[PDB]
Amino acid sequence: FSTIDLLNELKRRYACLSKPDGRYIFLGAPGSGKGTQSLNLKKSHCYCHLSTGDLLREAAEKKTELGLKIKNIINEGKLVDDQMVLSLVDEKLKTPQCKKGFILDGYPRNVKQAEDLNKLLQKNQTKLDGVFYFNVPDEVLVNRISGRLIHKPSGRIYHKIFNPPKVPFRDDVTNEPLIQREDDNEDVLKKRLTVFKSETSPLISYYKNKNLLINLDATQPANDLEKKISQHIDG
Ligand SMILES: Nc1ncnc2c1ncn2[C@@H]1O[C@H](COP(=O)(O)OP(=O)(O)O)[C@@H](O)[C@H]1O
Ligand SMILES: Nc1ncnc2c1ncn2[C@@H]1O[C@H](COP(=O)(O)O)[C@@H](O)[C@H]1O
Ligand SMILES: [Mg+2]
Ligand SMILES: [Mg+2]
């Protein structure tokens, strides 16, 4: 590790340290690009990526009664109990990775969860900076889910077409195998999009009333959408 390489690390470090702190919510149906954009901000703004889906799939891996309960709810495309998710969010929000800021990706998924989050932020003396809505049509989301591949250890997201890996079905960093999410099966994605429309769509109006909603056109390329999000934050 050279002096030039050492000084260049500092340049990179001082670029994200100089970025504003932020506490945002990414709202949008599965395949909208929430996880993609959360990984971008984690790199550019050092914001914590709080994914309830990731935390619950992790909880679903445990060979306990609670584990089977979560695994079966997840695989059916339905929502886990509000009290359970709240405890996971309350715990991750305490971690030191959330001091610069965070991205809530997958939470809140209903009006009740939005109220719990509100009470939790009030009691913890922390405030949301915005709620980004990933506006993308249903037809687009179908293809987005179909081609999705993830590297389970890192949570890096790929798409067979829109974001392909260097070598098929292998991670770009570790060259380790990729996986298809069990909930990305055609029939359960249909149930997931239904749950979104019924339980999560009223949050658009809820956060618009709270004057926190920021509309995004999530159908644009990922690198273009990244700049648009960064523009709302740093601008
Ligand atoms: N702007 C985009 N345009 C085209 N494909 C995208 C875009 N953003 C993400 N993708 C791909 O489509 C799928 C969306 O994944 P993801 O970001 O995890 O959505 P979500 O987190 O909302 O479920 C992934 O396979 C990803 O590689
Ligand atoms: N906020 C939440 N409330 C309840 N269940 C959730 C929540 N987030 C994720 N889950 C469960 O885990 C899945 C993960 O979805 P995703 O957010 O797309 O990773 C969902 O389909 C639900 O089964
Ligand atoms: Mg599957
Ligand atoms: Mg702005």
From Swiss-Prot:
It is an enzyme of class 2 (transferase). It catalyses: AMP + ATP = 2 ADP. It holds the Pfam family ADK. This is Adenylate kinase 1. Transmembrane segments: none annotated. AMP binds at residues 52, 57, 78-80, 106-109, 113, 192. Residues 147-184 are annotated as: LID. Residues 51-80 are annotated as: NMP. Its EC number is 2.7.4.3. Catalyzes the reversible transfer of the terminal phosphate group between ATP and AMP. Has very low activity with CTP, GTP, ITP and UTP and no activity with GMP, CMP, UMP or IMP in vitro.
